[PDB]
Design an enzyme around this catalytic site. Structure first.
Site, short mmCIF file in Angstrom:
data_model
loop_
_atom_site.label_atom_id
_atom_site.label_comp_id
_atom_site.label_asym_id
_atom_site.label_seq_id
_atom_site.Cartn_x
_atom_site.Cartn_y
_atom_site.Cartn_z
N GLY A 90 27.16 24.88 24.64
CA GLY A 90 26.29 25.33 23.50
C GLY A 90 24.83 25.59 24.03
O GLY A 90 24.51 25.31 25.37
N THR A 91 24.16 26.09 23.07
CA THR A 91 22.64 26.42 23.32
C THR A 91 21.81 25.12 23.26
O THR A 91 22.25 24.35 22.90
CB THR A 91 22.12 27.45 22.44
OG1 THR A 91 22.01 27.13 21.12
CG2 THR A 91 22.93 28.78 22.33
N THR A 92 20.72 25.28 23.81
CA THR A 92 19.82 24.07 23.80
C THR A 92 18.79 23.86 22.50
O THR A 92 18.64 24.81 21.86
CB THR A 92 18.54 24.19 24.90
OG1 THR A 92 19.21 24.66 26.10
CG2 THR A 92 17.87 23.08 25.14
N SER B 193 24.05 21.55 18.81
CA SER B 193 24.30 22.44 19.57
C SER B 193 26.04 22.23 19.93
O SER B 193 26.52 20.90 19.96
CB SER B 193 23.66 22.06 20.94
OG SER B 193 22.35 22.07 21.02
#
Ligand SMILES: [Cl-]
Lengths: 167, 195, 240, 241, 243, 235, 250, 244, 231
Positions: free
Chosen positions: E29-31, E74
């Site tokens: 996932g994204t930060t 995330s």
């Protein structure tokens, strides 16, 4: 008493009066007074000696001296007149039975004999069934034993109580 | 409904049941048969609250007919009466009890004996030589207590039954429009078409 | 509750549990149904591997559902009792609410519906049973004969057989049964039913059961001697 | 080989899921130790804060179950907190129903029975934790009772749990072989904690700062955990003799 | 083998491979980050602009629980939403019974127990999210991070997602260089920088910065989104630092 | 094993796709919609000559204005028909009117995907639902076990479906009469059937606004078969 | 969630074996030896207190348990399974008997109830069988003294004397030679201690052995006086000292 | 999920057999042999206890023969624990029937009920079947003396003489050879014991390895008596028939 | 592979294959386009027929007077989800006298789809949805995926060959967003967008399906000769 026994076995400990008190009151409260049980709970356990009352709606009370039932007013009158702090075992039994007698004689809902149970710390509880017997019936003036054959009979027969027989 | 009578004689059981069906201030029907055949040799008459009577009778009938098919065998009158009693005894503590009183007249083919059972809506069963439900017994039991003998013939049973119906027609306030009479014996169930 | 989908489709579009239930029927003893002009006869095979049997009390192969309808079967015996019980209950329920006994078609449709329900319900397996349901509709003199199977499909038959070696007896019935002129009497119908079983049965002793159903709730099961007379007459004509 | 996935018997009569839950117990790589004094029960446990971003105050495997009962856990924290919350609920319910504080040994048994159920029922997995309950019981006095994923439990004079439990166990065994008593003959709990720390140092062969340890102490009518400064005072006393 | 095919199964190691596979979804996932400041907390997240067709500032990722707790996560976004929905039910029932708003440590365990419950049975899947959350209560500021296993701890700074290593390194510097503490307004600026620095791991697509904060002085202890000038001020500070 | 509601890597439900294979093994059913009515025809396919063919009921009335033909595991259709009849009657009770053919079809199709681990598997039968209402006129729908229903001008289902559908492709036009449709169903049934088509192994039916849904007598169909033979011999 | 294991985990294999029951019996085989001997005026049950650690207080772990005042139980196999069975056995003695008839159940019927619980774990959904074999000794007015074995299958058999667990095969042979129908309780205790010494490796004393008897009524252990018909429990657990006294006359 | 571990106890094989029923029958084939023989004046039930011990308390032991009511009894072959579950159910059913109709339950009706319960476990629920086969010996006023057997499939049949458990093939041949219709109880007792004596896997047939029972109208006048034989009584009948 | 038997199983790389297979069903579905300005939001859908005798499967469903969607994938799943939206839109009206926000509608769909991806026994929804609406904050367009992911967009497209329409909208972004107070031009842009996804076949009168909602425009669907204007 059943659940207390199972609890005592589960915990490997002798049962406590507060446990019986709590279990009784929560049960009675749940049934909103419809279970007409008015109890005086007492006993000794590792915590000490205890005395409680329980009413049908689930309310509990603590005290050094208590009375319940239709003869509780006659009994409480005696307890309020004669109770003191630091009673001995012999004095307490006397006070207790005198309070019951007050009920026996003065209350029509109470009568016959006095039952007692003494629970002392570090001892076996002694149950004194018919501790006092101040109401034995006097001998009757007459015997009402009938002459045999006085009653009229129509039929006689042996009743088979035994099981089905062999052969 | 109103009057249901039963009498057990030597070799048969006779059930008499009124024909009237009054709903308020009007007599709606004067030819109502207040009975159901539970099995070839078992008849049940009934009286109580409207609707409940027939609903109960047909429910019992269905259950006994189901038993007959499953086992290819007719239950004894005693067995049927016990089944019926249990249903009523179950019913009395229900949300809405069956308000039905019944008489069960049967001929036991095994014992070769007629049998009459009186059961009320509470599930109170009694085996009797003669029985009734409602106000009928108040008039008829005195006559039966008097003229009945256990070795009577079916014809004598019918004559004694006529005596009962005549007394009821004389002293009861309600016009019950006569009775339908049915005989239960070894040969089965039949209706007396002239009474 | 146990909800596991046991009857499911396979890549080739088959429900194997339903098809394996038919294999249980194939194993079951042979049952045959033949309808005449004014009667229906249900023949049933009794495998003679079991002697020392008590034939008084042993569950008979033909079961009365009502006084006017009967049901025989091939397949799992224990499974058949459940269908028979349900059918008997429905028969009394129908009388109670409709005030008229079931038609043979209705009773068949019910039993078939139960069998189908067990092919797409969770946690249950299909019935390993095919039935032959026969009788006469109330106040009707036309004979009725229906068949059901585990999948739940049902249909009417002039004559039909189910169970082991049913392929052989169906072969016999297909050449011997004429639709334009069915067995005119009870004798002719029973004779044809016994003949058809004799193609498969082995000995004509206690291996053949026959039950004749006639109009107006007239149902009777033939005894050993009565059937044995048919067996005797058939083979004496055959010796020619 | 599905007899290794759920809690059913293998041909050897073994429950592999239970055995593997025991192995999860050492996943944290923490050693705990419990000992009894005259008036107290002390439990110490290694504290390891490997990340500098962590709030070290929130890193704990010692729990205050009730006023009287404390619990240290050997195993992953999620299962640890699962057990902690249940034990707290059970202790509170017990007091309500029976009118007195749940004893340490009874709570241990109750949690042990719950663990037993997971070994018998298939849908529930065992918790990968060993629960060490400590208190000063009003009847039995200083008490250490330990529970494991098998549903087994027993009382202890002293005990140790973790990867290096055996080294600590033998060290404690040898001490009680000398003293010939079932406890640490000491008046103050402060000195019993000093004993506990000293013998862990000797057994593991490692020195400790104030932030390397975590201490829980049970006295009559209360269980409490020591702060870093309380432990520092304890470490100073050890070093000065 | 086969121990990784079913949730709640212990491998011979004593591991739950299904939970470890859920972590892989989180790492994908994204930060997202969290910074604990003097009197509150700051949350920030990387939102990957997959296309120009995405409406700016509309697909909000950070979620509020009650009025004083912020949550960001995330991994699988729906799993995070499900967890927050539960968090809101937990917070509501707490306030219903006890009157006071749910404390952050109390709230942390409610999520923790719920996530841990999804590692107990094979009839459920573990959560595919690591959740960073926190806020201000009666005892002050608290920051937490919660993993798929149900494991959670308190944090000075927290980071998860694809650029977690980069972010963590940056957070560690702040802890070392500010032992006395960081202000709320400083934390917002630093949060912006760290997301920009952590964007090097997702450098293919450009991104949108989203920040929120709870602070006793700046927001009266309520969760609020950083908007307008204060957001632009943080973006400018972040853009200056990467160049 | 594997879930009953499992998706294949191609994005299809295994069980739904397998039930479609069972429908391919079923007997042929053909439906043709015209402005004078909709015709429904089926192959009976008796497994033996001793089976009384008139007991084979593969065409069924749902309401006076809606009929239905089936193909596949026909036992599965019974509960679908019962639901359809109940839905049709219930709507009339609630709204004092006939129910729309599409709405009826939609109600049947809602049952389709109610399977899991509700019923244990999809239906193994496809339905041709034909009817008439005031809003959309004469309509023919094809209800599948996927829960999907397509409206059709003409449609064939069962074992001879793709061959019959190609034939319906050429033959259907918007000006067909009812008589022309009847013969067309008979023609295509005769083409794809294994056994020789007659009044006993094939059944016709129609739905008109005036007379409603009617299953044809064997005497009536026999005449249409004779009429077909002569017109094919005519060129 | 929900317990979705509504199907049996114990099933018949092609050979007709119930695998999980067999494997449960294998777990019992690994368990520590326990035994039971019936005398004319009593019953004795005994086992080894296999302490898992010397730091563990083995007095807190009770392998021999009171079920009713006149019934006791001992086991071989998995201790935790035994512990929960004792809890259920104690409760079922009240719910399915004492609360109905106002008296404690006779040995055979309590055994029957325990057996039922163990059978159900062998057939019910989502559970394994209990991994224990029980030996239940007890007394009641109409049946006298009795000793029952209960296996993981739920099957139970009455014994004059028997042994289960580790060294049961050798122990049963030892008991066959020594047992007769004229044994007094003290003689049975003596034989129990002799038999149990063979299967024990390490220390053999009152602290490593757990032994209880079903014998005479103990009015001293009743806890109250005043009711003649209540005479006290027949179950009594022997003390560490009482065992050691009999080990000198061994 | 849980599906992975489901044995699926209630399914057909490709051949149309119920796996678990067939395997349960295999289990029962290793159980001690039980024999039932019906005579004109009564029924005999004989059964062999499995490899016993000298320390087994026989007089208080019961693993084979059980009483359902005063008129009906059963001989068990298979898992004893499974059998007791069903026996208690049967006992309750008989009492329900008695309460409802005020008549003792006909033998077949009881047998059908238990057989229907067994059937249920083979068709639904996903549970293993009961590994038990019964021989029902009973009397009622409709059919008189009756012998039935039921097995895990839930199928039941009536018999004149029948065996269940181990060596039924050998046992059934021996019964079929010496059984006659006009046979009496005393003769049937002898046949039962002789059959067991030949089919037993043990070296010799003794009293301590047997359970024995008779249902006789040998009760004072028109009524039926059940007799569960005591160890000493089994020892006497073994000497009488000339086996020991 | 070994981790695609059910929705309750992560793969070793953290993937949910059953969800991905459900996503695949959308790609097989017929193309549909969504786009909006500040005043109006438009749906354009290419309907698919079985053959020449069959009707063209409907792609657009109305949820409320101010909201509706287009579908791509399993149509019955779209019926279930659209029914749920209808109920939620309706609950908002009856209880709060409030038209349901399009953003909140997306949140509800996300949460409903999510439950099917984490539980045993069930399955993910096999359909993608494009929700358009006009609420108190103007025009909106959402893209729903059965993984649970819902995304607010200016324009988008889902289904087979949807990449062509999506690129076109990505170029035209600055133009069509400015089409305010002109419904016909916004539809034209949508019809031109969906045309970039066509191969072999072209937009006919019974092939094309268009829907629109706006400031003073209730959600209305156009089919048949009503869309001949735009062909
Ligand atoms: Cl417990």
């Amino acid at each position: 008493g059943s659940n207390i026994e199972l609890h005592s076995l589960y915990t490997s400990r002798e049962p406590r009066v507060v446990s019986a008190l709590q279990m009784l009151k929560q049960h009675l409260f749940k049934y909103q007074g419809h279970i007409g049980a008015y109890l005086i709970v007492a006993g000794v356990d590792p915590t000490g000696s205890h005395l409680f009352s329980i009413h049908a709606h689930g309310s509990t009370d603590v005290g050094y001296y208590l009375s319940l039932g239709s003869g509780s007013l006659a009994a409480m009158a005696v307890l309020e007149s004669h109770w003191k702090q630091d009673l001995t075992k012999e004095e307490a039994i006397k006070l207790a039975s005198d309070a019951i007698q007050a009920g026996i004689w003065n209350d029509l809902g109470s009568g016959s004999n006095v039952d007692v149970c003494v629970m002392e710390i570090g001892k076996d509880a002694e149950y004194l069934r018919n501790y006092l017997t101040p109401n034995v019936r006097e001998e009757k003036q007459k015997s009402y034993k009938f002459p045999r054959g006085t009653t009229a009979v129509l039929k006689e027969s042996i009743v088979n109580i035994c099981d089905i027989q062999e052969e | 409904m109103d009057i249901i009578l039963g009498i057990r004689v030597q070799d048969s059981v006779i059930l008499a049941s009124s024909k009237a069906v009054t709903r308020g201030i009007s007599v709606l029907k004067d030819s109502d048969d207040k009975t159901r055949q539970l099995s070839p040799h078992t008849l049940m008459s009934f009286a109580g609250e409207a609707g409940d009577t027939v609903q109960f009778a047909e429910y019992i009938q269905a259950n006994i007919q189901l038993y007959s098919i499953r086992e290819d065998y007719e239950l004894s009158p005693q067995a049927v009466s016990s089944f019926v009693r249990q249903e009523l005894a179950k019913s009395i503590r229900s949300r809405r009890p069956y308000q039905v009183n019944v008489l069960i007249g049967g001929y036991d083919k095994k014992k070769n004996k007629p049998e009459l059972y009186q059961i009320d809506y509470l599930g109170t069963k009694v085996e009797l030589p003669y029985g009734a439900h409602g106000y009928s017994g108040f008039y008829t039991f005195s006559l039966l207590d008097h003229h009945y003998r256990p070795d009577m013939t079916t014809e004598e049973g019918l004559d004694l039954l006529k005596l009962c119906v005549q007394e009821l027609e004389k002293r009861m306030p309600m016009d019950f429009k006569g009775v339908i009479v049915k005989i239960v014996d070894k040969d089965g169930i039949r209706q007396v078409d002239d009474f | 509750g146990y909800d596991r989908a046991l009857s499911i489709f396979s890549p080739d579009g088959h429900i194997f549990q339903v098809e394996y239930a038919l294999e249980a029927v194939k194993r079951g003893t042979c049952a045959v149904g033949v309808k005449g002009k004014n009667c229906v006869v249900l023949g049933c095979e009794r495998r003679s591997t079991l002697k020392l049997q008590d034939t008084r009390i042993t569950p008979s192969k033909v079961s009365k559902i009502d006084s006017h309808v009967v049901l025989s079967f091939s397949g799992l015996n224990a499974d058949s009792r459940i269908l028979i019980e349900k059918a008997r209950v429905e028969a009394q329920s129908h009388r109670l609410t409709l005030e008229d006994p079931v038609t043979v078609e209705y009773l068949t449709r019910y039993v078939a519906g139960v069998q189908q329900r067990y092919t797409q319900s969770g946690g249950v397996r299909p019935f390993g049973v095919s039935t032959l349901i026969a009788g006469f509709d109330p106040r009707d003199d036309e004979p009725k004969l229906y068949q059901t199977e585990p999948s739940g499909i049902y249909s009417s038959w002039s004559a039909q057989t189910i169970g082991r070696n049913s392929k052989t007896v169906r072969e016999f019935l297909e050449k011997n049964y004429d639709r334009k002129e069915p067995p005119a009497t009870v004798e002719e119908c029973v004779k044809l039913t016994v003949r058809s079983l004799l193609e498969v049965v082995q000995t004509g002793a206690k291996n053949i059961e026959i039950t004749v159903v006639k109009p107006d709730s007239d149902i009777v099961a033939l005894s050993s001697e009565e059937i044995n007379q048919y067996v005797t007459q058939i083979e004496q004509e055959k010796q020619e | 080989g599905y007899d290794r996935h759920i809690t059913i018997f293998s041909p050897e009569g073994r429950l592999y899921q239970v055995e593997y839950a025991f192995k999860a117990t050492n996943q944290t790589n923490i050693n705990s130790l419990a000992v009894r004094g005259k008036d107290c029960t002390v439990v110490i446990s290694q504290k390891k804060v490997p990340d500098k971003l962590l709030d070290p105050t929130t890193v704990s495997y010692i729990f205050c179950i009730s006023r009287t009962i404390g619990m240290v856990v050997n195993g992953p924290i999620p299962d640890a907190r699962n057990a902690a919350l249940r034990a707290k609920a059970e202790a509170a319910e017990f007091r309500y129903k029976y009118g007195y504080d749940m004893p340490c040994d009874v709570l241990a048994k109750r949690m042990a029975n719950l663990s037993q159920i997971y070994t018998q029922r298939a849908y529930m997995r065992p918790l990968g934790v060993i629960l060490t309950f400590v208190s000063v019981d009003e009847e039995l006095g200083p008490s250490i009772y330990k529970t494991d994923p098998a549903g087994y439990y027993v009382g202890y004079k002293a005990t140790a749990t973790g990867p290096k439990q055996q080294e600590i166990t033998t060290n404690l065994e040898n001490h009680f072989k000398k003293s010939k008593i079932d406890h640490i003959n000491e008046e103050s709990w402060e000195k019993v904690v000093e004993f506990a720390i000293t013998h862990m140092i000797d057994a593991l062969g490692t020195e400790f700062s104030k932030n390397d340890l975590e201490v829980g102490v049970a006295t009559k009518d209360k269980f409490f955990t020591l702060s870093a400064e309380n432990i520092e005072e304890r470490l100073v006393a050890i070093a000065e003799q | 083998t086969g121990y990784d095919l079913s949730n709640s199964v212990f491998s011979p190691d004593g591991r739950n491979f299904q939970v470890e596979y859920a972590v892989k979804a989180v790492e994908n996932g994204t930060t997202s980050i969290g910074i604990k400041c003097n009197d509150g907390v700051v949350f920030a997240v990387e939102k990957l602009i997959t296309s120009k067709l995405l409406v700016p500032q509309k697909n909000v990722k950070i979620q509020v629980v009650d009025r004083h707790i912020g949550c960001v996560y995330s991994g699988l976004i729906p799993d995070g939403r499900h967890l927050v929905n539960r968090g809101r039910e937990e917070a509501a029932s707490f306030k219903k019974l006890y009157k006071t708003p749910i404390p952050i440590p109390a709230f942390a365990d409610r999520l923790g127990q719920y996530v841990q419950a999804h590692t107990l049975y094979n009839s459920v899947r573990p959560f595919g999210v690591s959740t960073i959350f926190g806020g201000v209560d009666k005892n002050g500021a608290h920051l937490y991070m919660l993993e798929p296993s149900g494991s959670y701890w308190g944090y000075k700074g927290a980071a998860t997602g694809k650029g977690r290593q980069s972010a963590k390194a940056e957070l560690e510097k702040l802890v070392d260089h500010h032992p006395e503490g960081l202000s709320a307004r400083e934390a917002v600026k630093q949060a912006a920088k760290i997301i920009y620095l952590a964007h090097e791991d997702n450098k293919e697509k450009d991104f949108e910065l989203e920040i929120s904060w709870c602070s006793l002085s700046e927001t009266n202890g309520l969760h609020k989104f950083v908007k307008g000038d204060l957001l632009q001020e943080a973006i400018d500070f972040a853009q200056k630092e990467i160049n | 094993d594997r879930g009953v509601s499992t998706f294949s890597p191609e994005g299809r439900l295994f069980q739904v796709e397998y039930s479609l294979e069972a429908i391919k093994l079923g007997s042929t059913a053909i439906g043709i919609a015209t402005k004078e009515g909709v015709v429904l025809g089926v192959e009976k396919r008796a497994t033996s000559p001793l089976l009384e063919s008139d007991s084979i009921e593969k065409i069924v009335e749902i309401d006076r204005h809606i009929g239905c033909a089936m193909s596949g595991l026909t036992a599965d259709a019974r509960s679908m028909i019962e639901h359809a009849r109940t839905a049709a009657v219930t709507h009339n009770l609630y709204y004092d009117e006939d129910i729309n053919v599409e709405s009826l079809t939609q109600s049947v199709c809602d049952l389709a995907l109610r399977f899991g681990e509700l019923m244990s598997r999809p239906f193994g039968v496809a339905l041709l639902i034909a009817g008439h209402d005031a809003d959309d006129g004469y309509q023919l729908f094809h209800a599948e076990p996927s829960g999907t229903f397509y409206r059709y001008n003409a449609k064939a289902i069962g074992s001879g479906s793709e061959g019959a559908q190609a034939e319906l492709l050429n033959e259907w036009h918007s000006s067909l009469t009812l008589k022309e449709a009847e013969l067309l169903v008979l023609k295509i049934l005769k083409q794809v059937m294994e056994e020789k088509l007659d009044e006993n192994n094939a059944q016709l039916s129609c739905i008109t606004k005036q007379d409603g849904f009617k299953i044809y007598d064997n005497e009536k169909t026999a005449e249409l078969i004779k009429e077909l033979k002569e017109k094919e011999a005519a060129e | 969630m929900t317990d979705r294991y509504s199907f049996s985990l114990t099933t018949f294999s092609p050979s007709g074996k119930l695998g999980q029951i067999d494997y449960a019996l294998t777990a019992v085989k690994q368990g520590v030896t326990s035994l039971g001997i019936k005398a004319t005026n009593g019953v004795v049950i005994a086992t080894e207190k296999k302490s898992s650690s010397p730091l563990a207080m083995s007095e807190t772990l009770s392998k021999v348990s009171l079920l009713t005042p006149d019934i006791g139980a001992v086991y071989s196999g998995m201790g935790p399974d035994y512990r929960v069975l004792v809890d259920k056995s104690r409760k079922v003695a009240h719910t399915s008997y004492k609360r109905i008839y106002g008296e404690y159940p006779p040995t055979k019927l309590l055994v029957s109830e325990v057996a039922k619980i163990m059978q159900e774990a062998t057939q019910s959904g989502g559970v394994r069988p209990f991994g224990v074999s029980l030996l239940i000794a007890g007394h009641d007015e109409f049946n006298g003294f009795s000793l029952y074995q209960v296996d993981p299958s739920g099957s139970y058999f009455p014994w004059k004397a028997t042994a289960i667990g580790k060294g049961s095969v050798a122990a049963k042979t030892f008991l066959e030679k020594r047992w007769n129908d004229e044994l007094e309780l003290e003689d049975a205790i003596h034989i129990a201690l002799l038999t149990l010494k063979e299967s024990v490796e390490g220390e053999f004393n009152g602290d490593t052995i757990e032994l209880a008897i079903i014998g005479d009524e103990n009015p001293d252990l009743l806890g109250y006086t005043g009711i003649p018909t209540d005479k006290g429990p027949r179950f009594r657990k022997l003390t560490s000292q009482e065992i050691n006294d009999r080990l000198e006359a061994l | 999920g849980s599906r992975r571990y489901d044995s699926r106890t209630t399914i057909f094989s490709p051949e149309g057999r119920l796996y678990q029923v067939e395997y349960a029958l295999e289990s029962i084939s290793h159980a001690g042999t039980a024999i039932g023989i019906m005579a004109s004046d009564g029924i005999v039930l004989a059964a062999e206890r499995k490899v016993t011990s000298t320390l087994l308390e026989q007089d208080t032991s019961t693993e084979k023969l059980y009483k359902l009511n005063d008129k009906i009894a059963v001989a068990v072959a298979g898992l004893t624990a499974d059998a007791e579950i069903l026996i208690n159910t049967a006992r309750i059913h008989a009492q329900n029937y008695l309460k409802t109709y005020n008549e003792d339950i006909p033998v077949e009706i009881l047998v059908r009920r238990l057989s229907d319960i067994k059937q249920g476990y083979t068709q639904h629920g996903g549970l293993r079947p009961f590994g038990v086969s019964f021989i029902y010996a009973g009397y009622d006023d409709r059919y008189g003396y009756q012998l039935y057997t039921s097995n895990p499939s839930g199928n039941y049949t009536g018999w004149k003489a029948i065996s269940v458990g181990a060596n039924t093939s050998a046992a059934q041949t021996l019964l079929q050879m010496d059984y006659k219709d006009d046979m009496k109880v005393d003769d049937a007792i002898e046949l039962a014991l002789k059959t067991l004596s030949k089919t037993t896997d043990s070296s010799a047939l003794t009293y301590d390895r047997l359970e024995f029972a008779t249902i006789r109208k040998g009760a004072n006048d028109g009524e039926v008596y059940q007799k569960i034989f005591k160890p000493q009584e089994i020892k006497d009948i073994l000497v009488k028939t000339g086996i020991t | 592979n070994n981790y695609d038997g059910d929705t309750v199983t992560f793969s070793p790389t953290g993937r949910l294959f059953q969800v991905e297979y459900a996503l695949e069903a959308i790609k097989q579905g017929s193309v549909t386009v969504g786009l909006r300005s500040n005043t109006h939001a438009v749906l354009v859908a290419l309907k698919r027929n079985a053959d020449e005798l069959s009707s063209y499967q409907k792609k657009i469903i109305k949820c409320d007077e101010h909201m509706g969607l287009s579908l791509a994938g399993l149509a019955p799943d779209a019926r279930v989800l659209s029914n749920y939206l209808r109920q939620q839109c309706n609950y908002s009206s009856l209880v709060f006298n409030r038209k349901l926000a399009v953003e909140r509608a997306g949140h509800l769909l996300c949460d409903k789809a999510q439950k099917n991806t984490q539980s045993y026994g069930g399955r993910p929804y096999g359909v993608g949805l494009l929700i358009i609406g006009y609420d108190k904050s103007g025009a909106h367009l959402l893209e729903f995926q059965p993984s649970g992911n819902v995304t607010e967009l200016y324009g988008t497209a889902i289904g087979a060959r949807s990449q062509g329409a999506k690129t076109y909208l990505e170029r035209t972004l600055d133009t069509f967003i400015k089409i305010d107070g002109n419904p016909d031009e916004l539809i034209k842009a949508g019809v031109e967008a969906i045309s970039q996804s066509l191969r072999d076949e072209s937009l006919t009168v019974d092939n094309l399906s268009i829907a629109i909602v706006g400031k003073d425009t209730p959600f209305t669907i156009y089919d048949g000769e009503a869309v001949a204007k735009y062909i």
